[PDB]
Each structure stands twice: as structure tokens, then as C-alpha cells.
Symmetry: C4
Subunit: 136 residues, 4 copies
């Protein structure tokens, strides 16, 4: 799970220097610094005046900025769906189906211990009886 | 799962040509092209100034545009709920309950192999003994 | 699950006539009709300019409108959390743990059928042998 | 689950007095009272004109207000992810795997009652037979 929090923080970084490279020129409040894109891209990721506020005005300057905003959003929020889920799984299989996966790994092998002892007891009966067709 | 990523990308398309058909006339920044509706309908799907920014001004022109925005959002985001979930299911039944569904398909049939062998061992005891009421 | 899609569409209705009763007076674009509140309340439910756009200007007129917006949002989005989940449950217990809950209801009773037959076979051995302490 | 609804309402409070302390001075519509920050921080939590509306204009006054808004959103919405999930877990383990965890705690011990009775029956056979090598 936290192996993707690394990838997300890589995409956040990658796109932050992308937006600083492109838009630092004409949109210097939003993309002037690396740190100003690291804020704006947190804001665009949270979809708060992402398009009407940032994308639309940036796309008015460069129509090659349409894809940088769409693709950022698709990628960023998608590896959060992969991370949101990475919690539901590691949580629903931990509190619940890691404890059962073990209480049922034990309750199954606690009756191979019964069947396999009961088996021997019938063979020690097969030896006691098949030595009595040979005794009568 | 990805069998609905097709349906979503069909609704996205269907509605993009609907909005270009209707609003290209009077809302040409938003619905002028097919590709301007494919952007606007991504932004309306992301509910970022969806109503106050796009729907409200479009509904001021045509009050038949009220339903095109409500129904788009209901349908679009709903088949994402069917798709978000399509990940939780195929993921929680894959990493967890596809491996257990098989380790417990095997641990069950690994003791029909013990019971059905032990059974025979009692019948070969029933033959040894019922041949001794006939021998005494 | 769909037994709450009724309750949600009741809250949506209840609050729609509440907002038309109160704010139809001074906020007639948003709450003028029942049908204009059924739109605005879909928009406030989708948290798109819900506060800055609708609540803040409505609360400037009446500060008793603060609670109508907060409570609507808490209630509405909460019975969607109860409905979002009503899908994850009915879906994760249907495709996966309704089929297993039955394949393991059968695999369990298919060996009470083995044990309880094996039992008889030992009793018919107990009858054959306890009739041979009485025969020797 | 509701043991974190306390923590969330603590962070909501903690940050409400933080923003009233800092911004009451120059942003008195948003942070003038404790109760005006309790509204603004519900609106910032719902990410409705959170940055462009509140954060951006607050950060223009104080650039130490950048982190108060980012950290608030990260913390607040994150302990809702821990709470959203706290419902999926307590719900998916309740309606489904609390009833199965018990019907399978009983169906397992209802055959230790079969195996352990069948066991004795073979030992009473071992006694009857091992008393007949001593009788012949």
C-alpha cells in the first residue's frame, strides 16, 4: 500500500516540474516556482476551481495544457483509487480474514490429528482381527 | 470490470455529441466542438463548477438543458460506482478469497481421501469378522 | 439497499419544500419553485459552490439557514454512505460469499453423510463381535 | 468507529480556534468568530472554493497560512477515510462475516462431537477384541 504513496509522490513531483517548466512564463502565481506548482497541483488534485480557475485560463494561453490537466487528474486520482482500495483490502483482510485464515488453518489441521490417529486405531484392530482368522 | 470502462466511454461519447448538437450554437467555448464537450463533460463529471459554471448558464438559455446535466452526472458517476466497486470485488476476491477458495477446495478433498480410505479399512475388517461367525 | 434510495428521495423532497418555503422569498432563482430547490439541492448535495455560491449568500439573509445547509449535507451524503456501502456488502457477499456460503454448506453436509455411514459400519461390527464373546 | 468521530470533531475544533487566532484580524467574515471558522472549515473540508475562495486570499495576507489549509485538508479528509472505512469493515464483517464466523464456529465443533464419539466406539471395540485374544 505505502509502496504506491511513493509513486503518487513521484507523479506529484514529475508534474510539478512539468507545470513550472511550461507555465512559469505566463501563469507565475500558479506555476512560477516548483513550490507554487506543488500547491496548485494539490488544489487541482482536490478538484477545487481546477478547470474554471486554473485549467481554462492556462488552456487559453496554451491549448497543449488541456492534456497536462486532464492526464494529471486521471493519473493522480486513479493511483489514489489504487491506494484508497489498498487500505480496504489490507484492512478487511487483516482485522478479519487474517485471523480467520489462521483459526481455520488450525481447526482444519486439528482434525487431521484426529482422523489420522483414529485411522491407526482401526489398523491396530485390523492386525488384532486378521491375526484371528490365522488363529481359528 | 473493464467491460464497463467501455460503456462509460460510450456514455461520455454519446453525451459529448448531444451537447455539441444542442449547445454548440450559443455555448461555443464549452460545446462548440465534439472535443470541447469531451473536455467540458470531463469537468462536469468531476463536478468542478459543473452547475454554477456550466449548467446554470446553459439552463438560462435552454431549460431543456437542466436534464442533460443532471442525467449525465447521475449516469456517468453511477457507472463509476459500478466500476469503483468492480475493483473492490475483483480485488478483495482475488488477493484473498481466490487463494482461500482453492486452499479450502483442497483441504476439503484431502480428507474425503482420508475418510474414504478409512472406510474401506473397516469393510476389510467387516469381511474378516463376518467370515468368522461363518468360521466358528 | 434500494429500501434507502426511497429514504434519500424522501429527504431530498422534504428539504426541497423546506427551502422553497423559507428562501423562495429572497432567493427565487435557487428556491423559487419546488423544482428549483430540487436542482439547487442536487447541486448542494454534489458540493459544487454549495457554500460560497448558495449557503453563504442564503445565510447572509437568514442566519437560521446555516443549519438547513449543514444538516442537509450531513444527512443526504450520510445516507449515501449507507447506500454506497449497501452496494459493497450486497455485492461482496453475493458474487463471492453467497456462492461459498453454499459450496461450504454442502461440503460440510457431504461428510456428515460419510461419518454417519461409517458409524453404522462400526456398529454392525460391534454387533458381529459382541455376538462372538457370546458365542465363544 | 465512533471512537474517531470524537478525534475528527477534535481536529475540527483545534483548527477552528487556530484560524480564529490567526485570521480573525484580516479575514473576519471567514475567521472572525470561533463559529465562523467552524463554518469556513466545514466548507474547506468539503473542498468548495476552498483554495481559490479561502486559502489563496488568506495566503496572500500570510504565506504561513498555506500549511494550515493543506495540513487541515490532509488530516481532516484522512481521518474520514479512516472513518469511511471503519463503516465498510464493521458493516462487511457484521452483516456477513460475524454470522458466518459463528455458523462455522458451530459447524466445526458439531463434528468434534461426532469424531470424538466415534472414537470411543472404536475403543469399546478395541476393548471387546483385545479381550478375545486373551479369551482364545
Amino acid at each position: 500500500i505505502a509502496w504506491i504513496a511513493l509513486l503518487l509522490l513521484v507523479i506529484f513531483y514529475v508534474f510539478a516540474v512539468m507545470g513550472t517548466k511550461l507555465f512559469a512564463q505566463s501563469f507565475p502565481e500558479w506555476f512560477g516556482t516548483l513550490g507554487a506548482s506543488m500547491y496548485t497541483l494539490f488544489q487541482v488534485m482536490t478538484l477545487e476551481s481546477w478547470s474554471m480557475g486554473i485549467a481554462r485560463p492556462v488552456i487559453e494561453a496554451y491549448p497543449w495544457a488541456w492534456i497536462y490537466f486532464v492526464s494529471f487528474i486521471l493519473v493522480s486520482s486513479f493511483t489514489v483509487l489504487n491506494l484508497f482500495i489498498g487500505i480496504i483490502i489490507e484492512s478487511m483482510q487483516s482485522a478479519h480474514w487474517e485471523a480467520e485464515d489462521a483459526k481455520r488453518i488450525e481447526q482444519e489441521q486439528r482434525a487431521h490429528d484426529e482422523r489420522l490417529e483414529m485411522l491407526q486405531l482401526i489398523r491396530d484392530l485390523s492386525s488384532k482381527v486378521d491375526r484371528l482368522e490365522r488363529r481359528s
